[PDB]
Amino acid sequence: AIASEALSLLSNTYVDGTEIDSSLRIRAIQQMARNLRTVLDSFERGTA
Amino acid sequence: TGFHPGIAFTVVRQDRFATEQLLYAERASESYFVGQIQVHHHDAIGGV
């Protein structure tokens, strides 16, 4: 259950085909991966 | 019929108009910068 992160992730949807926004992309890749690692670890522990 | 006494009476009237005012705008203005571009487009039927 989360809404702020989803809204932030889906609020861009690009504009017209501009650059990749390397800083924002790197920040998102770091944060989402860090959250997903522990999320999947907890899910695997629960399933086991 | 013919006369008019000196009784006490008064009337009340109201007005509704506009006016112009002048103020001091100083020299330094608000620091209204520009950041990124936000767009939102959606196509349903006919046009976008």
Automatic annotation (TrEMBL), chain A:
User: Domain of life of the organism in this record?
Assistant: Viruses
Q: Quote the protein name from its UniProt record.
A: ORF40
UniProtKB/TrEMBL annotation, chain B:
List the residue ranges forming a coiled coil, or say none: none
Domain of life per record: Viruses
**What is the species of this protein?**
Varicella-zoster virus (strain Oka vaccine) (HHV-3)
**Protein name (Swiss-Prot/TrEMBL):** ORF40
